[PDB]
Amino acid sequence: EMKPHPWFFGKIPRAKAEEMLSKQRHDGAFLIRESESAPGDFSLSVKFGNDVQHFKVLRDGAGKYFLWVVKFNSLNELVDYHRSTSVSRNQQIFLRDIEQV
Ligand SMILES: [Cl-]
Ligand SMILES: [Cl-]
């Protein structure tokens, strides 16, 4: 039952992440991509209404990952944490997997 995650898109451009997410029906649909403007950093792109919001994946000194305050030993834990705690300080948006073709 071991499957790869449906949310890791590697190095897709910010704009293509917006393109792909715009077609998703449900708020919270998201992906992790490897930033092109900041190589070696990740970004989290999320559908909300007619918009796609982007969040920097930030790192502490020890290489933990975070968006705001709570930090995680992995992108995988950061993603899962934010399935039930909002990614946004403006709306209640919870990560949910893309509907896959
Ligand atoms: Cl919350
Ligand atoms: Cl979920």
Curated annotation (Swiss-Prot):
Function: Non-enzymatic adapter protein that plays a pivotal role in precisely regulated signaling cascades from cell surface receptors to cellular responses, including signaling transduction and gene expression. Thus, participates in many biological processes including regulation of innate and adaptive immunity, autophagy, DNA repair or necroptosis. Controls signaling complexes at the T-cell antigen receptor to facilitate the activation, differentiation, and function of T-cells.
Signal sequence range: none
Record localization: Nucleus; Cytoplasm; Endosome; Golgi apparatus
Keyword Lipid metabolism included in the entry's annotation: no
Assembly and binders: Homodimer. Associates (via SH2 domain) with activated EGF and PDGF receptors (tyrosine phosphorylated). Interacts with PDGFRA (tyrosine phosphorylated); the interaction may be indirect. Also associates to other cellular Tyr-phosphorylated proteins such as SIT1, IRS1, IRS2, IRS4, SHC and LNK; probably via the concerted action of both its SH2 and SH3 domains. It also seems to interact with RAS in the signaling pathway leading to DNA synthesis. Interacts with SOS1. Forms a complex with MUC1 and SOS1, through interaction of the SH3 domains with SOS1 and the SH2 domain with phosphorylated MUC1.
Cross-link entry Glycyl lysine isopeptide (Lys-Gly) (interchain with G-Cter in ubiquitin), positions: 56
A Gene Ontology cellular-component term: cell-cell junction
Full-protein interval shown: 54 to 154 of 217
Domain SH2: 7-99
PTM sites of type N6-acetyllysine: 56
A biological process term (GO) from this entry: branching involved in labyrinthine layer morphogenesis
Family recorded in the similarity comment: Belongs to the GRB2/sem-5/DRK family.
Name of the protein this chain belongs to: Growth factor receptor-bound protein 2
